Amino acid sequence: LRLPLCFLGVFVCYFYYGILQEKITRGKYGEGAKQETFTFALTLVFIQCVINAVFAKILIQFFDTARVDHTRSWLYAACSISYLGAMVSSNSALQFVNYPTFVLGKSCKPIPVMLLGVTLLKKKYPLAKYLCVLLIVAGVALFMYKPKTVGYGELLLLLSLTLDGLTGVSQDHMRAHYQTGSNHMMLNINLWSTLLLGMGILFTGELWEFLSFAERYPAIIYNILLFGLTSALGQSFIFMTVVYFGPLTCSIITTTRKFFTILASVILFANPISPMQWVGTVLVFLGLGLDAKFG
Amino acid sequence: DIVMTQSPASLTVSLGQSVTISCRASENVEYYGTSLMQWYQQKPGQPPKFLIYGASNIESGVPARFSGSGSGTDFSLNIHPVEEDDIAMYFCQQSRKVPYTFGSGTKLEIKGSSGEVQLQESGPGLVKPSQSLSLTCSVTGYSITSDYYWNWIRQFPGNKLEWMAYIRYDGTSDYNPSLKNRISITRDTSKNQFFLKLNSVATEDTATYYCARAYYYDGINFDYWGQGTTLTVSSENLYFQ
Ligand SMILES: Nc1ncnc2c1ncn2[C@@H]1O[C@H](COP(=O)(O)OP(=O)(O)NP(=O)(O)O)[C@@H](O)[C@H]1O
């Protein structure tokens, strides 16, 4: 038994997922006056949720079908609301901000999770937090803010961070009190989010517009489909890595994956970055790694 | 399956003393920081009474005297102001793995000596070996199609409990892997009953069978119990005895 693939599969899958997301959301469809921007975040998130739910169903039906799910449906619905809210808010924010900024902001999960835990759950962090978390804040203030009001994009990113913190709190509570497996939770929350997003797109009137837009630029279809696939397989790998190595291994793996994704976005796509902004990303990632190691 | 061992077989204690009963599991019973342990109390000739879940959380209605502590593979139940009421056999149960297992039981004895759910079990008393048996548990005051687990458990002579199986209101059922090939659990919603059928009963099946209602929270907790029905497997017809 060899486990390099715990690194290789997750890294490749999520790296390609990030590249496809950048190519889709920030792509320059059309030209000149005919140029159009991808404003259909709901449809993208709905497709991703559908693909993830299908893969989760396959995984549970083929892997470890003996387990019985003790969780309550309403808990799954409540978690899925925040989960899909976070995903939609982040994807919509990506329309305004660059991709490096989007990923860096979405990486700062520890700050909202600590705030939620201390303010609501009352858990105290002697050394796990309050140290290497101020490092993350310093890095963000170095990158997002510079010496030389905030727009819609960072507001939406902050909202996504808050929703992600709420989702994490709910998931932790349900895991503790109902012993829910990763595959079952992933399937259920993805199904609930798929239903909610289907209702939202159908009633909002965005499905017709998205279909017309795709008809205008058919290639995007392929892209988004691949994107969805890369969001599933990699996720599955992470699940395995959760049960094979442990949580710390998964955390460090995703941290290095995010760093390499930022590097790829900066270099391949010619996203403009400058000195004293690289320092912010370095500080953020160092703080995230130290927090993962301790606590 | 996890084997639960209760350290004190029987504790001779006086009134007012602080009594601690220790239970140990063969494997860690923690899951994301939650200890899946339950403590029940059984008075003589009565079904077990649910006391504690999660190893530290006192069930509503239980006196504040009882408390729980411990983690990993070692747990303890403490009663500081012991009274006459808390005189019984205490059982520790693990809900980490599907074949839920109870402790051997610790007996405590003193020196010098429509608004609720009703479960009723019925079935034959004396049965020849190799015959097929069918116990029926009928529920009144509640519907088996609402959010609760309905379990069949049996207690052997010597007070050794053993969870046989259960059926959820969704229709999903779980079985003890040891007995999975011998028992079958079914339900009839029209009459609001559920049945347990045993094939090829043997002399080792003699026991008191309870049907219980349980809810899952930090482990399965058999909060409501039936009155228990005795079953004796023998090759002789019991007459004049
Ligand atoms: N045990 C787990 N560890 C990490 N991610 C998990 C786990 N279970 C499910 N996931 C999901 O897997 C995905 C990993 O993608 P990613 O965007 O890197 O998450 P992350 O929050 O940035 N890193 P992490 O804190 O480890 O989940 C997320 O959607 C997580 O919710």
Residue numbers in the entry:
A (entry chain A): 12 to 159, 168 to 314
B (entry chain B): 1 to 113, 485 to 612
Task: Quote the study on this structure.
The endoplasmic reticulum (ER) cannot synthesize ATP but must import cytoplasmic ATP to energize protein folding, quality control and trafficking. Here we report that human SLC35B1 does not bind nucleotide sugars but indeed executes strict ATP/ADP exchange with uptake kinetics consistent with the import of ATP into crude ER microsomes. We have further determined seven cryogenic electron microscopy structures of human SLC35B1 in complex with an Fv fragment and either bound to an ATP analogue or ADP in all major conformations of the transport cycle.
In view of the few inter-bundle interactions, we attempted to stabilize the protein by mutating the key cavity-closing residues. After screening various mutations, a Q113F variant was identified that increased the melting temperature (Tm) from 33.8 °C to 37.2 °C, and the ΔTm (ATP) shifted from 5.2 °C to 6.6 °C. Although transport activity was reduced to approximately 25% of wild-type levels, the ATP IC50 at 2.7 μM was only somewhat lower. Consistent with the increased stability, the cryo-EM structure of Fv–MBP(Q113F) was determined to have an improved resolution of approximately 3.0 Å. The Q113F mutant structure adopted the same conformation as the wild-type structure but with minor side-chain differences located around the phenylalanine residue introduced in the cavity-closing contacts. The map density for AMP–PNP in Q113F was in the same position as in wild-type SLC35B1; however, the improved resolution now enabled its unambiguous assignment and confirmed the toroid shape conformation of the ATP analogue. Matching the positively charged surface of the cytoplasmic-facing cavity, the negatively charged α- and β-phosphates in AMP–PNP were found to be coordinated by R276 and K277 in TM9 and by K120 in TM4b. The K120 residue also interacted with γ-phosphate, which had circled back to interact with the adenosine nitrogen. The T273 residue in TM9 also formed a polar interaction with the α-phosphate, and the ribose ring oxygen was stabilized by hydrogen bonding to Q254 in TM8.
